Amino acid sequence: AYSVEIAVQGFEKRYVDMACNTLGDIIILAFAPKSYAALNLAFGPERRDVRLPWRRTRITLIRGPHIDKTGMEQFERREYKSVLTAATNCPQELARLLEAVKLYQFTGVQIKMQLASAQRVDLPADVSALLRXXXXXXXXXXXXXXXXXXXXXXXXXXXXXXXX
Amino acid sequence: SGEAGSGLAFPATSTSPEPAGPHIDLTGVTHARGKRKASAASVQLVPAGGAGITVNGVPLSSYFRDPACREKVLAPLALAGAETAYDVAARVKGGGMMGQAQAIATALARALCVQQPSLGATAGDGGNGEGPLAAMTRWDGRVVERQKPGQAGS
Amino acid sequence: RGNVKDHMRRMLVEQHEVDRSVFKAVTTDKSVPLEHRLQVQRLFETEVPRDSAANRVVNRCVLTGRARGVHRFARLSRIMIRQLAHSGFLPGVSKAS
Amino acid sequence: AARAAANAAAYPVDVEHSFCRRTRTAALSTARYGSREANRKLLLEHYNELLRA
């Protein structure tokens, strides 16, 4: 019971496009029934490829070096986004995914990844006794992504708890 | 059904694109969309004597609450002469008040067009046609010109 | 120009780390000590390097020695930003619209 | 006499209790220690202390 979200950031639409297509190839390979003989596949209708617009902000400059206050010119940064959606139930192929994105290097393009997943929780027996139903899936971990030699293939990975 | 391209690019100094159609849905309730500003709106038309007229949830006379703006809402409806008999269900987004009015006016016009073909303009026959309401179908997609990258300089 | 002298000022903000100064600032922003804040603030901003408070930094450019008209948008200064921009040796900042 | 609904403030840290009505879910987040697992330890203790109510 694991859910994966991959967010992807770029400057040239070419590179974020190739990134989206190659990770889509990886997902479909990663849960691929390559042979019939074992038959719990997740193409449930959660699955998407949601595209996204950007953060419109223009940053302008003086053209001239000295007096030149007539001399303006406009400049501009672009960020292009996609999100990649899947989820699955066994962990060994999830590890194949994480090691797959560990190997294939992508040019100029940020990988931010969301991994909400189920993980079991010990309780002191007092609160289990004093239990005797809603979602309450609240871990939401957080990690840094810079100033320590990483050009941002950061993985964030909130967690979902279960203790009935 | 066979709808077609209805859109226009009427304006000066900045273009426009309202790619949304107007169409009748199988509930007997047509739906249409209209923007005349970058602020935008949609409509949904039921032939009914129920709640009457509705944008943004509320009855209209408190949301829009300048009278001139209210007849800017009602102007295609008053031009039609088919005022009462439809429930008017509608949604809006953006901008400023009578821009919302004339936008929702255009959308109401489009829904009325798919209700009655000859009153207003459509793409049923090659994106052409003529009725009293055919003038205000194609939206007036002029926006503000951009604040000039340059000087007052005076 | 003198980009490095400011780096020396930044290094003094961090060699005499700002934590020591700010912790003394904590006890002067506390109203809980009834007094002695005047004694704590009497020294401790004078024994502490006066050139290590965070206002003496002036945020110069890094390419050149620009001290005026800098940008934290991409850590450069306007004329260089334009030169690199037209060259395109910068992360995808194109002429706008 | 006007303020934004989303204060989105700063100069502090917390456990950020929050609820999402869209999916009927509570949300608590991590902020204190550098590593993720130390924060998992702190919020796990906070979850146990949450159930003392």
Place this chain on the structure above:
Amino acid sequence: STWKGPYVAVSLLQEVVALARKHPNWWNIGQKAPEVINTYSRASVILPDFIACRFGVHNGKSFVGMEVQEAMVGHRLGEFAPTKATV
């Protein structure tokens, strides 16, 4: 600025304690304190008492001697060290 710590006069105070070898303010009410006091900074505030003190304040070109009296007690010393743009 009275909130959270209202007074700053540290170097002035070092010179004041140098004066305070027999009396800070004529405890031995005031007798002009003939030893000159010459500060090097005018950002200093003025503290209650401090009367009859010969203060020499810097103007950027020299030291300006002014005797303090009862009215200038709630002031900051730089108000008495101008740049002399008379005309």
Place this chain on the structure above:
Amino acid sequence: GKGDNRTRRGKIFRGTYREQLPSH
């Protein structure tokens, strides 16, 4: 001042009617 000091209008001109968000 367009009623800069004491109005419900000129204090949006002096940036105070928008109360400043706590940031640093």
Place this chain on the structure above:
Amino acid sequence: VMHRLRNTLFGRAVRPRETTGRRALARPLQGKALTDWYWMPPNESPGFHSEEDEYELRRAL
């Protein structure tokens, strides 16, 4: 008054504008942000082919 239970549950307090000195601790530190701002090579790269003196060599002639 229910948030008192949520408060003592979570140990929180009004963060801005109270003058109790806590804001100077809970503020983020700018010390990393101040010294990563510059970038100066030493003018003599220990690897090889230092350009900052090659320009001097070219303009010597």
Place this chain on the structure above:
Amino acid sequence: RRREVAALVDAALTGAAGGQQVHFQPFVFNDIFQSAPAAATYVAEALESGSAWGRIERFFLAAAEADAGKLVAAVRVEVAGRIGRKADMAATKSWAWGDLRLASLTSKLDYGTAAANTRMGVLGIKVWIRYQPAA
């Protein structure tokens, strides 16, 4: 041998870069035309080296229709400064082959620059290049 030097340049980046290790990827130019500022620094390092302008523009033109119709559409090279022997006024000079449409935004196109420093003083060099659609 080679493989000492492979690891040497690879480590030379590696210790320089702080964190990561970085391959080295030399792909080499097979002319002076396929790049613009490569041609520009050929101009500037020529112009330091006492080349008179005529032999420069000679070798450029000979190389130009030596590679006629293949990868170069048009060449315009301008230099500003003092070029000659007794130039003392500020001046510029050039030459241009073919037609370039610098107003045409569908042009695969390039800009070049370089700088030279003669015995008189400093220079300015700009090179503008247009290509056929084989790219």
Place this chain on the structure above:
RNA sequence: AGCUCUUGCAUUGCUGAAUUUUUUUUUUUUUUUUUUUUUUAAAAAAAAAAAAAAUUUUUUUUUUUCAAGUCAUCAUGGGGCUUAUAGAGUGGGCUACAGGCGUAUUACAUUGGACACCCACAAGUUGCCAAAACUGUCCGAAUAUACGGAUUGGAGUAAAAAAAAA
């Protein structure tokens, strides 16, 4: 080796100006017919016909001249400097104030001021937030008005919410 020392009439670079308008008329795809190069084949060439059309929120982009400006952006030719034209440290000054000039804002009210309103709808949900006004109420005496808000003194202060017991 270092200049914030000079020289923009020694310069590179970059820009100013109005030269304010021109940036669509041009190709490409397909068809038919035919011919140029190479020991089973592609381009090429030529006659004609039809369609596709020309980048971005719509401005940027293409443009001729002034020894126009800048050595204090860096650079750099020449000249100058090196008990000082080099660096620090502390405090000024870079913001001074007969006059005069340029650029803006705010008004001189009633189409308005004030106060409330719902706290009206935006640009702006991508990896929620206004004002003018609309609606209500107070004001119209050359009052310099309850318009206007410049100068000047003075001071840095209120609470509201609700719980348990007698």
